[PDB]
Design a protein around this ligand. Structure first.
Ligand code: ATP
Ligand code: ADP
Ligand code: CA
Ligand code: MG
Lengths: 358, 598
């Protein structure tokens, strides 16, 4: 019988069966209670609910609501009994040990899973690329991580976290559109602006040159049809929004961009392995989906690195699901079936066991 | 013995919960009616609202309103906490004064300007901003409901009559002077904010007119109506959906126009559903709080309060002094100021000090108008002529004078340090005429009056040095402009081979009305395939011209940056520059058409 793979993100939860090309269920990591629903139904009934995200910046903060998301995932999306399938969950880099135990305890005690493993999300995206050595820039809705990985093992001393991700970009886009006389303000409107962002934004290879073009002429303007039929036109907002990834000052942040955060992670690693990290920079998550981002990271990292070194960026087409695909690969391996924590092992050693096996 | 040492007393019996007055003293009296701060021995800090000398009993009735609200609806944290009527020392007299707790913080205008500013600078995000706005609207609408329970209507809710508390972050409503009972004629109102019905006919004040005020107050703060005195919040929002609803700054960044909306949103629906509708169709305070706008984007109450504490303990965004856009009305207003100086010059009552100060502000207004749009070139030249005519009247007419005019020289010298464009040519010519007129005045007054002092002599040469630096800079830029005209005309000649074929192909593509649709990839698939096919036809029609158009914009874009978007002395240059910009837009949109639609 097939294993389950679920990837819990700040914005989106992805769920499916080990062995599939893609996840069968993708919905928002949102729980809504009276002033209780999950996902898109929680959004549709928002008017009678207080919506909350249980995951903040990659890390679980509301265990009550997280329990609800998993119950939703199993019973409503996948429509399965968790007592009959083993389960692969994912976790953020530097997830506190206390969280890992609580995760384990919920699977065994609340859902009665016969077995489970938990894996680091970035490490799954590197496995998915066909690699065991490399550095991963994972950028999703709540958080970005540069994770250097050597021969299968993440190097926690060189991991950097950046609280700058898709949610912040969507929010920035909402601000700058108000200069065009467009006041998006509700959570419904926030979702529409996220749509605009995903379909209209790109990374300029040369920001100052695109700004010049945008001011000289109207040749970068592009129109969007709202769900109610209204139409808006937008211009330099298209490339200014994702530029914030390289210039956090645009978001009021006194911090390094993804290109420089990546460089710094590499520099915190031993000189001997850097060449390989530079040549195996892999990119992961929905916030790395901007047209033109791969070329910009190539340009920007080549600017900071020694001129000897070869900088090679990998950017899989479907990389918003790289983490999930990694998990589907790993659970499906035949060699892996020994690695699961079994119900017997948890009944005999309690939540603490997770650190021995994972 | 000064007024700061004299005691206070009570006029009526005060309200239960009132402090003891023993020891209390006046600290200061602020800036209408005069409000003085009462420092207690403990320092609780109280406000004493002193009666106007005109004395129609507006103040005593205000107390009776507060009293009645407390008895009927209860107290309320977002409403002023009043103690009774005192007698306080002010201006060599004792006066009646309404005594209440000080809301220690900023007025609503200053708070919302500061909130909006921290958002634009990136100190808080959009969630925080709009959450905090919605938080404020809930509090205000809760107070209009609280007053409705007492059967009292406020009638004058506006930015000055709402004050935010620094300690709690809570807005507090004050100023019940113009209150009425429900369905009685209102005692007064403010015209910019007033609801249409309020003050006209049989039916007077209601909770509906208060709800209206609460929204026109927020609209004022949110849109920044202080920047544009020619509009008033109770007229609501204007929609511009065909054209731009915004203005562009120098560097291509859009700028919000106060009162103009580009799309309907929860927010615009909120304004239209309340401000743009009659009393019976308008929601009351509790219905308004159910509105989409107030229901949907809300943050945690403690989160909002926190953001307001932080705004209030930070630096206040100052009131903008001359960011006003130069409209035909404002430029008319400035011409009327010059017309009074010419009118007083004829009658020998010309103040020389103030005409040179006012002429300097005219120069800045005119330079501002040239950069932006706003007024056509005929209204500018008429203004420019009126300046020149005013300089004409000064020369013809005939160390205090130094202090008036130094500010003008400094401003011009700061302008000489900057990197200039071609739009500065007219600006610098005018500045040269000003320095020359300043020079002539100072030298002339020494002929028949006070001889030249060391300060004046040194000033004359600081003006002379600036005049020459101005001439050299003005002469470099006129040469550079001639290179720019030639470069412009050559580029136009190249466009001949492809212009009309490309313009036509792209006009046909545009008539299909391309547009990114909301929805899934499956839902939009037919639509996206139709565009790509149209786009593929268009790029096939112009295939032979594709390298020409690519090379054309590598040259045209840097030249268009140099020629700018503002008015220029040379009107033939401007007409030509726009023809390049139109050709550049054709070429560049075709150079990107594959990337945008295929
Ligand atoms: N084509 C696209 N272009 C730009 N952004 C996109 C695109 N598709 C998705 N996104 C953004 O990516 C984010 C979702 O990515 P992902 O699901 O990998 O994040 P997550 O795993 O939910 O959160 P996190 O990784 O922060 O825990 C959203 O913010 C979404 O707006
Ligand atoms: N309790 C208070 N705390 C802080 N400021 C106050 C208080 N009461 C009045 N003020 C200030 O005094 C100003 C004028 O007082 P107000 O009662 O509005 O009189 P008026 O009817 O003359 O406008 C207000 O704009 C406000 O700044
Ligand atoms: Ca993730
Ligand atoms: Mg007042």
């Amino acid at each position: 019988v097939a294993a389950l793979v679920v990837d819990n993100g700040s914005g989106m939860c992805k769920a499916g069966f080990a062995g599939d090309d893609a996840p069968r269920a993708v919905f928002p990591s949102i729980v809504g209670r009276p002033r209780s629903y999950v996902g898109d139904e929680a959004q549709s009934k928002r008017g009678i609910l207080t919506l909350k995200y249980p995951i903040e910046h990659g890390i679980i903060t509301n265990w009550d609501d997280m329990e609800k998301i998993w119950h939703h995932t199993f019973y409503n999306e996948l429509r399965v009994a968790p007592e009959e399938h083993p389960v692969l969950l994912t976790e953020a880099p530097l997830n506190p040990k206390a969280n890992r135990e609580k995760m384990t305890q919920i699977m065994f005690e609340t859902f009665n899973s016969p077995a489970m493993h938990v894996a680091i999300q970035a490490v799954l995206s590197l496995y998915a690329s066909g690699r065991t050595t490399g550095i991963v820039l994972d950028s999703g809705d709540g958080v970005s991580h540069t994770v250097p990985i050597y021969e299968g093992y993440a190097l926690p001393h060189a991991i950097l976290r950046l609280d700058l991700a898709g949610r912040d970009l969507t929010d920035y886009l909402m601000k700058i559109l108000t200069e065009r006389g467009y006041s998006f303000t509700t959570t419904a409107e926030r979702e529409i602006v996220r749509d605009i962002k995903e379909k209209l934004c790109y990374v300029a290879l040369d920001f100052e040159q695109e700004m010049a073009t945008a001011a000289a002429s109207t040749s970068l303007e592009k129109s969007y049809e709202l769900p109610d039929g209204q139409v808006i036109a937008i211009g330099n907002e298209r490339f200014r929004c994702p530029e914030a990834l390289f210039q956090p000052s645009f978001l009021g942040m006194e911090s390094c961009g993804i290109h420089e955060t990546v460089y710094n992670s590499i520099m915190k690693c031993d000189v001997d392995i850097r060449k390989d990290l530079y040549a195996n920079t892999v990119m992961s998550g929905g916030t790395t989906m901007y047209p033109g981002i791969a070329d910009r990271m190539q340009k920007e990292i080549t600017a900071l690195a020694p001129s000897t070194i070869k900088t090679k960026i990998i950017a899989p087409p479907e990389r918003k699901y790289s983490v999930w695909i990694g998990g589907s690969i790993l659970a499906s391996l035949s060699t892996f079936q020994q690695m699961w924590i079994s119900k017997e092992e948890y009944d005999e050693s309690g939540p603490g066991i997770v650190h021995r096996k994972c | 013995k000064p007024q700061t040492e004299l005691p206070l007393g009570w006029k009526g019996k005060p309200l239960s919960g009132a402090p003891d007055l023993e020891g209390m003293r006046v600290a200061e009296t602020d800036k209408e009616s005069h409000i003085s701060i009462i420092e207690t021995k403990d320092k609780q800090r109280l406000v004493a609202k002193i009666e106007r000398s005109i004395a129609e009993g507006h103040l005593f009735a205000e107390l009776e309103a507060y009293k009645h609200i407390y008895k009927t609806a209860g107290k309320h944290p977002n409403l002023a906490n009043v103690h009774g009527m005192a007698v306080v020392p002010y201006g060599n007299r004792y006066y009646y004064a309404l005594l209440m707790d000080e809301v220690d913080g900023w007025r609503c205008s200053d708070t919302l300007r500061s909130l909006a500013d921290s958002w634009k600078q990136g100190k808080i995000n959009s969630e925080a901003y709009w959450g905090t706005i919605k938080f404020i609207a809930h509090r205000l609408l809760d107070v209009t409901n609280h007053l409705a329970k007492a059967g009292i209507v406020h009638n004058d809710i506006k930015p000055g009559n709402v004050v935010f508390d620094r300690a709690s972050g809570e807005p507090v409503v004050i100023d019940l002077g113009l209150h009425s009972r429900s369905g009685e004629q209102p005692k007064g109102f403010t015209e910019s904010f007033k609801a249409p019905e309020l003050g006209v006919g049989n039916l007077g004040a209601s909770e509906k007119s208060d709800v209206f005020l609460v929204v026109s107050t927020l609209l004022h703060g949110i849109e920044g109506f202080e920047k544009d005195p020619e509009i008033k919040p109770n007229q609501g929002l204007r929609f511009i959906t065909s054209e731009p609803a915004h203005v562009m700054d120098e560097n291509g960044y859009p700028i919000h126009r106060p009162g103009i909306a580009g799309v309907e949103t929860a927010y615009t629906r909120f304004i239209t559903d309340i401000l743009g509708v009659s009393a019976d169709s308008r929601p009351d305070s509790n219905e308004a709080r159910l509105h989409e706008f107030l229901s949907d984007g809300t943050i945690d109450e403690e989160s909002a309060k926190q953001i307001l504490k932080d705004t209030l303990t930070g630096e206040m965004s100052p009131l903008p002094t001359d960011v006003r856009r130069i409209t035909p009305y404002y430029l008319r207003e400035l011409s009327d100021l010059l017309r009074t100086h010419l009118s007083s010059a004829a009658t020998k009552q010309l103040d020389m000090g103030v005409v040179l100060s006012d002429l300097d502000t005219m120069l800045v207004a005119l330079d501002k108008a040239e950069r932006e749009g706003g007024v056509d070139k005929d209204q500018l030249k008429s203004f420019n002529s009126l300046i020149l005519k005013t300089y004409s009247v000064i020369g013809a007419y005939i160390n205090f004078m130094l202090s008036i005019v130094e500010p003008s020289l400094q401003r011009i010298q700061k302008h000489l340090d900057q990197t200039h464009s071609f739009s500065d040519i007219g600006s610098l010519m005018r500045a040269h005429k000003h320095l020359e007129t300043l020079l002539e005045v100072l030298v002339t007054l020494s002929q028949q009056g006070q001889p030249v002092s060391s300060e004046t002599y040194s000033f004359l040469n600081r003006l002379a040095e600036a005049k020459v630096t101005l001439s050299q800079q003005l002469n470099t830029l006129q040469q550079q402009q001639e290179s720019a005209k030639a470069q412009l005309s050559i580029l136009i000649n190249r466009s001949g081979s492809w212009a009309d074929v490309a313009r036509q192909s792209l006009q046909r593509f545009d008539s299909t009305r391309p547009v990114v649709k909301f929805g899934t990839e499956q839902y939009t698939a037919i639509h996206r395939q139709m565009m790509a096919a149209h786009a593929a036809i268009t790029l096939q029609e112009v295939s032979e011209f594709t390298d020409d158009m690519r090379n054309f914009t590598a040259d045209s874009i840097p030249l268009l940056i140099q020629l700018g978007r503002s008015s220029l002395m040379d009107e033939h240059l401007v007409e030509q520059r726009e023809k390049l910009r139109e050709l550049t837009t054709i070429a560049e949109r075709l150079n990107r058409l594959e990337r945008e639609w295929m």
